[PDB]
Assembly symmetry: D3
Homo-oligomer: 253 residues x 6
């Protein structure tokens, strides 16, 4: 039950990932075997809620790729249910300040370190009580990644970085540039500068920087700056671009 | 990607609608072809969440009837996901004051006009980036309808009507009469008076009034007073009343 | 675990029904409380297969309306699964001759009366072995209705009527009229005559005639001639026509 | 539409229950016939949300066992939708103080006694308006059970017990012992003492105590102390323990 | 309710397509807007059966791309349900001889041209009776494509080509090459020769040749020889290969 | 992609199993970690068809327990789809004679050994072509178990045992005892004798005998006689009986 993604970050080994906007456990498995270090379960139209995350985690389980799940916000209930279904690494959206970061962390840890409920029923997280000493071991294997999406969050980064249990800080270029006044234009120099310096700052604090970047050369640049969890594509972009390129090779006839 | 429902309201053409309490994309399509101007996706037992709204929007898409979606409350996350799946007209429940109305509006608009996230993945809203200049065009095509359900909301109507981006104000007779002390008795004169004068007041402010009314003559009355989005029935009422009337024609034998 | 629909037919009490083309257990429950004697689970776009039938049966269970299920054909494996999930009355499509009617009957009965498998797991049908003596009681509570849809089936009707275990014979006017040369027009006198003569003949043999008919006058006509399970409308027709009429009043 | 579970509690007849962590309406029905007085719909990975609760309520309806539903928190929207789908007894999690208890109660009652919305569409709760005078009868048949899971909640118990409409108070041993500093060790004397005295205190206030306890002798002890809704097992524990015991009788061969 | 795919084939306009192995209506819509003339609904793990086909058809409806559905075999009941949910072009698997091709055609046509049942309930196919004269117009808008997958089917090709109502003949290179002794290697000259000769022969008879081929050069070769419905890739191959190439660039 | 269940049978190592009547991938995973050598995916009310099998296989994949899937009958199309989604061991129902056993075997093997279609799309079975030489390795890792359920099948057992590719013969006591005249009572000496003689005979031919038996003593008896895949309980029986016993202790 050791979290290998968390251990890799801690050891400074960079992890290359793919963002999943589809909810299918079939495509999840198809992608789990494609050679990524991690996959981000982030679908915005999931049909079966936590059960959708269950089947994606089951699909991914036997593969080397590690799952990370993005709840739709920093929601203590959502977090509790994702941890019970067996999620060990979370990407928590819209973390704006250190208080919010500390709340995300506390939601993942049993008392006294946090407020995670032991609950009434057996859960997949403990493999139905088959993992020996699960209660004692669980806290140390939770990996909390916080997403910074605004000027305000960027402003508060040194304090967020000071929060114990924040293992990583993920920057979403699209949302940040929108908030900076360049929506759709993350490549604008002021935006790239802010991202580069955040990535360096996170790394210098002994925490893992993450980012999503579909431009392959930019991704490489972030990796050199020390980004340790880098999503380099999104499943639905891969599919849409491949399909469009294929149809264009023939034109509509 | 022009919102024809929003344009019709703006132009003062009244829109006749049906409330959908069933979640089926099959019944949605069956109803989409029945000749209504708009359909309200408002099911309270939807199985597949945003994915349920996806399949209803897909069912309705080729028909003249326009979809409006009612999130279960004024929930920034819910709103973001409904807009990403392609919803352009929202009916936001339990708007009690102008602050809440302004928050609903801001949730639907990209920065700087609002807080809508550009997000990380392609979305159905932009048809996966196939709508040219989607980011630049989206804000103007969002249509926000706010639902007033209480004495407090009715009290605050002049201020709600003053909120930029509130395109329409919908009155729910059942809930309002309950709050006024006549639960189940919306036909009580004091209640009808409050509704009539709200409808006139909304219209006089240059905004669209909406209401749900299953009594055909009352519906016509509201339309004369200037109501511009009037739901005249509910799918599950149509079905239950038709079935009961049919069985009664034969009696149990 | 008495099959009350089956007993009503046997007693000559007519049963007024509604055909369900939607698969939803929510609409099934909404309709189960509307006053019909029976509901026909016949959806052609069901999402969950036997599981969808399970939730419709569960929805209907506490109401007076009795369920009847139409498998998509006379498929012994489909019939086995529907019986295991708890179906006791089947409307079996496209029964063309006495051999096919006998196969449908044998599919519903445990040996030696039929080929129904006792199976390996507990099943909802026996309420997980909570119905005492289920294996011994089950056969007599199965109710098999065969659907006649072609001129060929009409020709073989006398033989079908001689099949023991056939409790009912259901006539589908639209398909029959198409087979007869009047697709879309069951109102033709030749179609009506075949239908009405069949009803008389079925009842004469001591079996239940059934039919789907959305025209109230024709429905009362068939009832007068002795029909015992008459489906008088379809859920999706009710909804579509009510919606269309409503929108029209504001147009 | 009389709530027989609520009436049994009121009359002091103890109700023996099973906690359902599976969401299947098939297993729900299989368990509904097993001889329990009540079943707790509490699955943490439900696929179809309110629709999942619909099919479980439909499965259970013809059986003597009575359904109770645990929303994932004291969420006015969640509560409204569960009541509309026909839930009459709720177990509300994480009630910490009397204000929260009063809010849970008010969420279940139509105005003026509460804030429950009459709503726009017919609902399963009224059996689509077929229950005569439903609006007038509904409030009295709602049964609110509040879950106390912390030292803070235990501290506030006398005030929670003073709230009109709180019919019962449920103690979750696992969560309480975790909060007391004995996570995984509810059998610790100080914890058992706190639970025993809460059970007596609830009962002495004329309200129903509830608890979940899988140890059969401990369960009997709580029943003697006056606990009136006692869940004595969890479906997924029954299955996991039975399967493990069976495989062990043969060993892997 | 004109079948535009069918008219294009008839007019000799080639149609470039994509094969869908995923069942999602979200990915179906994402692909429907990518520029193909047609999409083949062929998923082998569909969750909701006919209902899954319903949501894919609904997703695709407003786009220029035309849907074609592949039932899992030449199953009259499966074909009836797909037609009722609104399918107008079918790719029918494992058609081995002219008798099987005729059965597939008759399954799609109302009497007296075929055995398609008019049915009891309204269906999406007629848009719930909103398409005027649907019963009279439907037969001529059905488009039947038969899939040839074996040496036996190739031997009977001349006869299959004589079946009225067969609008198209689809060659599946992987299965044919396996039947011929080269499983996994359609590139063998003997396989290519059989494929190319068949294409010429099909077009010669005034029917549309079709084929799935992910190799662009071969695809252009078949088009040059007169193929009219060419599926040039599969959704799951596109995704798997793009994902794998992407991960590799960072390895 | 070694089939480890198949190798265990071949090596004469007995495999203790559990029959799954529930379809849930959550309960499938909960049971996959309970200690069984194999689990039988046999649900009769599955909601998602092949997709439901996909999520159960995915749930089970990382555990030591090996999955075996029971198609609802000896249906080549059903077998094709289950193999494509990744099933390597099939329990094929109602195999009555050697011809039917051979058909089941040929359905699982690529030409020229069988009729399994290579197909058009990538499939989970080959892990989307990530298993090297999958087409060449697949046939030898398929494991076909035939279910004998009638006196007729018992009569033909010697011939069935001569079919190459039949790795195992599974006896279903409830169905056999019903066919023999003792429905509900497999305990009868005549039934037990037929079962035990069959087990000896199967093992003698160098094939694996299998059986479902919830009685521990009988299970050990069959194991002693040489049975190699013994399912010793059903998930829904375990749950129902545990729940009932629990409620009873408080009654």
């Amino acid at each position: 039950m050791e979290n290998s993604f968390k251990a890799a970050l801690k050891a400074g080994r960079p992890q290359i990932g793919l963002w999943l906007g589809l909810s299918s456990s079939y495509s999840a498995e198809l992608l789990a075997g494609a050679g990524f270090d991690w996959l981000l379960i982030a679908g915005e139209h999931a049909p079966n809620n936590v059960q959708t995350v269950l089947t994606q985690l089951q699909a991914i389980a036997p593969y080397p790729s590690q799952p990370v799940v993005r709840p739709s916000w920093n929601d203590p209930v959502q977090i509790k249910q994702l941890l019970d279904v067996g999620t060990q690494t979370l990407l928590v959206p819209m973390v704006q300040n250190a208080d919010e970061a500390r709340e995300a962390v506390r939601a993942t840890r049993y008392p006294p370190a946090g407020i995670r409920g032991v609950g009434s029923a057996l859960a997949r997280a403990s493999r139905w009580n088959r993992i020996p000493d699960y209660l004692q071991k669980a806290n140390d294997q939770m990996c909390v990644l916080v997403q910074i999406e605004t000027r305000e969050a960027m402003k508060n980064l040194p304090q967020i970085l000071d929060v114990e249990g924040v293992d990583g800080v993920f920057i979403g270029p699209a949302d940040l540039s929108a908030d900076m006044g360049y929506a759709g234009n993350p490549q604008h120099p002021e935006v790239q500068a802010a991202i580069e310096q955040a990535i360096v700052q996170i790394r210098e604090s002994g925490k893992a920087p993450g980012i999503l970047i579909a431009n392959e050369q930019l991704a490489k640049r972030y990796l050199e700056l020390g980004a340790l969890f880098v999503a380099v594509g999104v499943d639905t972009t891969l599919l849409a671009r491949a399909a469009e390129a294929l149809a264009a090779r023939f034109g509509a006839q």
